[PDB]
Design a protein around this nucleic acid. Sequence first.
RNA 1: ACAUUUAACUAAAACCCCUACGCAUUUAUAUAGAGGAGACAAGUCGUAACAUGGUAAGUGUACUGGAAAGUGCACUUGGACGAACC
Length: 191
Amino acid sequence: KTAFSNVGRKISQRVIHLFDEKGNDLGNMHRANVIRLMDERDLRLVQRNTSTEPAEYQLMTGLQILQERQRLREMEKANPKTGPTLRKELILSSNIGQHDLDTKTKQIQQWIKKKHLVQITIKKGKNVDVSENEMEEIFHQILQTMPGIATFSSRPQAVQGGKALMCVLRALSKNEEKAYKETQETQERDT
RNA sequence: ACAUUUAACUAAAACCCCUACGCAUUUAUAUAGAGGAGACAAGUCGUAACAUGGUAAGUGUACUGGAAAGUGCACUUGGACGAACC
Ligand SMILES: [K+]
Ligand SMILES: [Mg+2]
Ligand SMILES: [Mg+2]
Ligand SMILES: [Mg+2]
Ligand SMILES: [Mg+2]
């Protein structure tokens, strides 16, 4: 998270690859020499590219710093590209009541619907002996509620010496969805 | 609706009406189904309250929500503010 704003007269790094306001490459210069050009022409320096190992800073007028972000405000509006995926977690118990399982199963539908990743964990019920046969039958029982909407990303594993099972769900991908749709029609319509 | 008749040298005889009660009305029981409260017990999800209970609590009202509840507006103390200046 950054913004196209002036860095000020406090530079952390001694050597900077300074750039002119008109786009000319002034070349690497000492940190002190950078501030002299900020006063001689009353200009503010903005870090254009952080990624490069050599520091890159461009000195431009305040009006030029307004037009720049005014364009980053349109490019993102025109073509927004926010793809981070949130991860949600649930920790159930083998002996979880159905009423609580329908409440937690409806919460997974809201997350899936928001393209989130739902990590579900199941643990042995309080002083209850149970294997992994019916302890893994809760995932299939939750996934069934979301037939086409959801699919496994990971699969059940013995996270803690078998006393727990962990799975991760995701919203079905567009292509996968279309494939599911196609299959659904054949079973009923063709018959 | 219904009618003064016979009789009368002692005096008597004769008498006999038709309409109501209902698909009205009162109350209660029984029955499909739905839903409360309580006892027993203390499974499931949380942790709402009691300590400034971890966002002080509560009243009334409104909206909202798996659930205790949450929030807004006004009100209360059945909260507090540490009690000389500095
Ligand atoms: K409260
Ligand atoms: Mg509490
Ligand atoms: Mg509280
Ligand atoms: Mg209140
Ligand atoms: Mg709310």
